[PDB]
Amino acid sequence: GRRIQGQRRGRGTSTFRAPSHRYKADLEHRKVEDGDVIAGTVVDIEHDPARSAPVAAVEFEDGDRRLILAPEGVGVGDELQVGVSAEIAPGNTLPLAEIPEGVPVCNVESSPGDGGKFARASGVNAQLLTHDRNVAVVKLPSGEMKRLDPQCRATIGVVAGGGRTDKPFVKAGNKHHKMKARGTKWPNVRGVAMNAVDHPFGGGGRQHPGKPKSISRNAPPGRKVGDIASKRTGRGG
Template identity: 40%
Template sequence: MKKITSNEPIKMLQQHLAKIHEKRPLLKKGLTGIQKSTGRNNSGKITIRHKGGGHKKRYRTINFLRTQNSEGIVCTIEYDPCRNANIASIYDFEEGKFYYILAPEKLSIGDVVKSGRKAEPKIGHSLPISKIPVGSYIHNIAPKKEKKAQISRAAGTFSRLTEKTLNYAKIELSSGKQRFLSAKCLATIGIVSNELSFLFPLKKAGQSRWLNKRPSVRGVAMNPVDHPHGGGEGKKSGKGKTLWGKSTKNGKIRKKFLVKKNPND
């Protein structure tokens, strides 16, 4: 595909892109293979239980670092097997290349998206937080300047910009937690797509095996040598212990970080 200049009309290209099939991946070069870890570390020991199997899939390389000033058009909105959100393929007018981004809600084929300091605060545009109005919904947020986006990337998640100064900004995550970031950090306008993904239950046990999830056996169904809850006539209740005998009741959910006092004060 030849390089398109910004002076050429976009309407003809938008009509052509509306006919592209969405089920097959558009970018063949953006696909890479994934080696299954099955919950094991580099020494082969299981660190995450109930993982194994899973359908064979290829990873779509997503552009989480949209710092350069660029302008592109949405070619397709595709399904990604490695995440619960949809992705969108973008054709960059300046570089003449394709790349994938996380597709926000209300982003359709043929829309023009921009990134960098010259971008306007519109859906799908990536720009510094200092140029985003207070109260806007944002996603795909970088925790530090010139770093890849790591915050609010799952389907249906978002953050809200509550306060902003010349140097810092305060955002509220969808969980209610608040974070302080640099105003130079980049974020994308909008809410991540496929927000109703949690409403579709698994129709059979085999779907969990496709998703690399192995079954979890209840402790009361085991023998006494296998679990503290095992054995006995009937079900045991009130023990509340893990497989290794640690209590699951009245445990600390969150670590309390102690602030060291300045001895000079």
């Protein structure tokens, strides 16, 4: 047959790529030598096209103008501090070691100094729980207990733009506009609505899948469709 849509995806053509040129900034944490003596005033609150959430434009003491992943509550004129001896206030970035337990953090790092990997989407937060000299256990928004290095930096507060999911798109036109700012192909044609040549679920006189939807992890790309390595299906039971 022909390659399925998921195989055309990996080729990285125009249709599948994200509009990178229209993106503002690669929201990463600042680099401090040590000591903490790095701070700055917030100039403006802008819209990040990449995440549909706001981003704070901060100007630092050493002339540096950079955009940062803004938590809730941050405004113009606010002073945010980045470093080891930073204040335990919303918007400040300091390692997990210095941050007290039970305090909601966002833009958490995997490896120290990487820039921030976890808890970056609209209104989410990571929850810091346990402390040690070796391990700082953070509870990620998915409900997972991530055992992390205490030297991993994190910003205090929940990410801004909370409750974005609440309002329905209502009409296809609204989904269109959102999708045009991401790296996705939209609309979605069901495989069951395609021809045999085009998808494993294509064909027949009526629309139904050919074999059971649950596919093995070991399945090759071109066959791995439907419910990938599902531990279960359905709502009941």
